[PDB]
Amino acid sequence: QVAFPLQYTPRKFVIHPESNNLIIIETDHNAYTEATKAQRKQQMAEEMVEAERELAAEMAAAFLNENLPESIFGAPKAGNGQWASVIRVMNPIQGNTLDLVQLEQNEAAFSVAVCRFSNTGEDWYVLVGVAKDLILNPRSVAGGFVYTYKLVNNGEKLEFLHKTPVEEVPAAIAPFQGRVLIGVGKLLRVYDLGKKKLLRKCENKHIANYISGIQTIGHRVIVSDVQESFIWVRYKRNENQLIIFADDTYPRWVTTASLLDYDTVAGADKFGNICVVRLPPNTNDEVDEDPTGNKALWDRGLLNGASQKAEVIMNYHVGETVLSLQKT
Amino acid sequence: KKLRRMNRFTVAELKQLVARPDVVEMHDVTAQDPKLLVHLKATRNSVPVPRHWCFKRKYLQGFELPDFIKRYQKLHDAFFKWQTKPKLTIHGDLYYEGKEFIDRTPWGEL
Amino acid sequence: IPYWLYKLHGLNINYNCEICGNYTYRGPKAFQRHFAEWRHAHGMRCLGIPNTAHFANVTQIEDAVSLWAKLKLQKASERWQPDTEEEYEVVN
Amino acid sequence: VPVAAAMCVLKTGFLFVASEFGNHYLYQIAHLGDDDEEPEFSSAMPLEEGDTFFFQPRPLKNLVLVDELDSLSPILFCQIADLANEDTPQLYVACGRGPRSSLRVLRHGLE
Amino acid sequence: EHLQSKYIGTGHADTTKWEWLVNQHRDSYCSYMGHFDLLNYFAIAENESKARVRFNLMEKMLQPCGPPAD
RNA sequence: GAUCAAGUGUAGUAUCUGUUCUAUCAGUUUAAUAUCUGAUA
Ligand SMILES: [Zn+2]
């Protein structure tokens, strides 16, 4: 092992394909950002003087310089719902930080992607999905943002472009056909880059619950629901629609997913399991959704899910929770 | 006492209060928790109660040899050379009285 | 008629349907069939309401209409509104 | 020391600190905590309710680090890729919680 | 059958929403306490010590769904 | 389908023959009925 320090709990990273640098998102609950950590320190020094006053001034000056490392003494625990988060560009050969964007207090990065957009061609972009004022338990949130940066200097610096608001946490981001697919809560949306903000080309509201992950292959999109496992979606390119065409027959608390082939998904869950789910032969992805309402009224899916079902072809309890799957 | 049997939603009221009015049956209104019941009836992989539960008659009071068998070695090969899976019903397809009458190579094949 | 059909089979009981012009069908698991019958289907047509499973077991006009309001709002909401696609400077 | 799932004091004068997450530590106990530059608090001292004893956190005084069991718990994210132009792909592993987080590069081999 | 009553968290035809959910929540918290990896997940997600996560779960065992219906 | 009487047999479960079911309301009860208990003819 060679180990390179990070500042908060890393949630995800992506390899920028040309210069091979890692874009890492780090995020903690009960945490202060460095700006807030400094401001907290400043007020506590002033409060210590305004509690003798010559010695208090010395102790306050001492305290402002007293700067014990978080790695040894612990990061100071902010209250419930308080978040600190950073986006780090890092070289994988030796872990020098090339760039470090710091997000606002109580912004929590949950998703990241590196991509090109069709409109801008060669230009690279980092999209980072952020929750604002997320409370975990009981769950509530002040919506979210997607931050866009233009990757520049051979993928060594994040040039901030714009910050686009969204209604709920953008929990997954996936580049799709020169556009970006972002899962905001239970809504799956296709976003064009735009100039001042991302533009919502398409949206699907039929996902049962919160979206944890998004994989893609061709026109197929595999959506990981937080509890209702795998949903297969097709993007109808000409018709501008995201259509659900298949689902699993079990609840799974999916943590991560991997595509094995065009028809097959390996998944893992919060309960230490792995599964492989496959679409049965002659599953049809060329499916409609009705412009009047018929396919949500008369015509319908099976068991209160989609009309076609995936087969579970593998199940195994690993004995311990899996957060990464990769075919390699 | 009959009073609590009057202290119930109407079918109209239960139909409008819920995300899925198409799962609301006449009887559902009479439950101890009609809102939990209708919720459970709407869950994504859940199986309906056998429809005969309210019938006055008992459940069923209203073979061909599989082709590979029917087709020493032959009898082994019926099981280990040419045995086809029968038509299998999917999860939740309960039996009832009237039921009958980019590359695409698979990963991890052999 | 063997009168255990009236009592035991439940053909004593009766229900009206306003959608069926106030017509009546006697016993419960017989009555339940009119939601797929021409009196009912014509009543639903006369109110501009499709006779979906959502309206099975609904016998009253104001209910069928108000449920058809709530369902029409729901089924308008549930889908993609391409009038609410976004275009650059922003326009929908 | 890092927050521990378990501590064992060995008869031979070592403290083993099974870290809650990340690497585990063996420390030699250099001193038994019988200094007096730093005060000893007591249940017999007068104090109020809501009031509290206060102490100063400071670097390792009674403990000396002697071994570190390099530990991947928790692995939060992973990519297997060659990013070094070696023969063999490395595993890029996002590890740890909080300020003991790390990105670790794993190669098949011996240091 | 009668002997099922030896086992807490079983139900019967007059089991309410509240009784059933309180058993689901109590069984869930006991499962989280036993499964070391499931406990890891919550400690990392909350940025909280495994010992405080366990304590918070034990505190939640008393009244996991709020008070009985009425 | 419920319900009363009688024969017969088994470790236990029952079978089998001969009857009753004709009007509304209230209470009990049921998923809804029904049965049952009162009332009005
Ligand atoms: Zn009708």
UniProtKB/Swiss-Prot annotation, chain B:
* Localisation per UniProt entry: Nucleus; Nucleus speckle
Known consequence of changing residue 51 to K? Does not affect methylation by PRMT9
The covalent link annotated as Glycyl lysine isopeptide (Lys-Gly) (interchain with G-Cter in SUMO2) occurs at 41
**Modified residue annotations for Symmetric dimethylarginine:** 57
The record's account of how the chain is modified after translation? Methylation at Arg-57 by PRMT9 is required for the interaction with SMN1.
- Recorded consequence of changing residue 57 to K: Abolishes interaction with SMN1; Abolishes methylation by PRMT9. Abolishes formation of omega-N monomethylarginine and formation of symmetrical dimethylarginine
- Name the consequence of residue 58 to A: Moderately diminished formation of omega-N monomethylarginine but greatly reduced formation of symmetrical dimethylarginine
Q: Which residues carry this modification: Omega-N-methylarginine?
A: 57
What does this protein do, in the record's words?
Component of the 17S U2 SnRNP complex of the spliceosome, a large ribonucleoprotein complex that removes introns from transcribed pre-mRNAs. The 17S U2 SnRNP complex (1) directly participates in early spliceosome assembly and (2) mediates recognition of the intron branch site during pre-mRNA splicing by promoting the selection of the pre-mRNA branch-site adenosine, the nucleophile for the first step of splicing.
Q: What is the protein's given name?
A: Splicing factor 3B subunit 2
UniProt organism field: Homo sapiens (Human)
Q: What is the lineage of its organism?
A: Eukaryota, Metazoa, Chordata, Craniata, Vertebrata
Gene symbol here is SF3B2
Which stretch of the full sequence is covered here? 452 to 711 of 895
UniProtKB/Swiss-Prot annotation, chain C:
Compartments it resides in: Nucleus speckle; Nucleus
Tell me the tissue specificity: Ubiquitous.
Q: Which domain of life is it from?
A: Eukaryota
Q: Where are the zinc fingers (Matrin-type)?
A: 15-46
Positions of post-translational Phosphothreonine modification = 84
The entry sums up its family as follows: Belongs to the SF3A3 family.
Quaternary form?
Component of the 17S U2 SnRNP complex, a ribonucleoprotein complex that contains small nuclear RNA (snRNA) U2 and a number of specific proteins. Part of the SF3A subcomplex of the 17S U2 SnRNP complex which is composed of three subunits; SF3A3/SAP61, SF3A2/SAP62 and SF3A1/SAP114. SF3A associates with the splicing factor SF3B and a 12S RNA unit to form the mature 17S U2 small nuclear ribonucleoprotein complex (17S U2 snRNP). Identified in the spliceosome 'E' complex, a precursor of the spliceosome 'A' complex. Identified in the spliceosome 'A' and 'B' complexes.
Q: What does this protein do?
A: Component of the 17S U2 SnRNP complex of the spliceosome, a large ribonucleoprotein complex that removes introns from transcribed pre-mRNAs. The 17S U2 SnRNP complex (1) directly participates in early spliceosome assembly and (2) mediates recognition of the intron branch site during pre-mRNA splicing by promoting the selection of the pre-mRNA branch-site adenosine, the nucleophile for the first step of splicing.
Name-wise, this protein is: Splicing factor 3A subunit 3
Q: Which organism is it from?
A: Homo sapiens (Human)
Q: Corresponding gene?
A: SF3A3
Curated annotation (Swiss-Prot), chain D:
Segments forming a coiled coil:
none
Highest taxon of source: Eukaryota
Site, Interaction with SF3B5: residue positions: 20, 97
User: Which compartment or compartments is the protein found in?
Assistant: Nucleus
Function of the protein: Component of the 17S U2 SnRNP complex of the spliceosome, a large ribonucleoprotein complex that removes introns from transcribed pre-mRNAs. The 17S U2 SnRNP complex (1) directly participates in early spliceosome assembly and (2) mediates recognition of the intron branch site during pre-mRNA splicing by promoting the selection of the pre-mRNA branch-site adenosine, the nucleophile for the first step of splicing.
The record describes its quaternary structure and partners as: Component of the 17S U2 SnRNP complex, a ribonucleoprotein complex that contains small nuclear RNA (snRNA) U2 and a number of specific proteins. Part of the SF3B subcomplex of the 17S U2 SnRNP complex. SF3B associates with the splicing subcomplex SF3A and a 12S RNA unit to form the U2 small nuclear ribonucleoproteins complex (U2 snRNP). Within the SF3B subcomplex, interacts directly with SF3B1 (via HEAT domain), SF3B5 and PHF5A. Identified in the spliceosome A complex; remains associated with the spliceosome throughout the splicing process. Component of the spliceosome B complex.
Its UniProt domain note says:
The core of the protein consists of three beta-propeller domains.
**Protein family according to the UniProt entry:** Belongs to the RSE1 family.
Name of this chain's protein: Splicing factor 3B subunit 3
Source organism of the structure: Homo sapiens
* Span within the parent record: 333 to 443 of 1217
Curated annotation (Swiss-Prot), chain E:
Identify the stretch annotated as signal peptide in this record. none
Its subcellular locations are: Nucleus
- Provide GO CC annotations from the record: nucleoplasm; nucleus; precatalytic spliceosome; SAGA complex; spliceosomal complex; U12-type spliceosomal complex; U2 snRNP; U2-type precatalytic spliceosome
| GO molecular function annotations of the record | RNA binding; splicing factor binding
Q: Which keywords belong to this entry?
A: Acetylation, mRNA processing, mRNA splicing, Nucleus, Phosphoprotein, RNA-binding, Spliceosome
Region Interaction with SF3B1 and SF3B3: start and end of each range?
4-65
Which GO biological process categories is it annotated with? mRNA splicing, via spliceosome; positive regulation of DNA-templated transcription; regulation of DNA repair; regulation of RNA splicing; U2-type prespliceosome assembly
Q: Which residues carry this modification: N6-acetyllysine?
A: 6
Could you say which residues are annotated as the site Interaction with RNA? 9
Into which family does the record put it?
Belongs to the SF3B5 family.
- Quaternary data: Component of the 17S U2 SnRNP complex, a ribonucleoprotein complex that contains small nuclear RNA (snRNA) U2 and a number of specific proteins. Part of the SF3B subcomplex of the 17S U2 SnRNP complex. SF3B associates with the splicing subcomplex SF3A and a 12S RNA unit to form the U2 small nuclear ribonucleoproteins complex (U2 snRNP). Within the SF3B subcomplex, interacts directly with SF3B1 (via HEAT domain) and SF3B3. Component of the minor spliceosome, which splices U12-type introns.
Query: What is the protein name stated in its UniProt record?
Result: Splicing factor 3B subunit 5
What species does this protein belong to? Homo sapiens (Human)
What range of the intact protein is shown?
Answer: 12 to 81 of 86
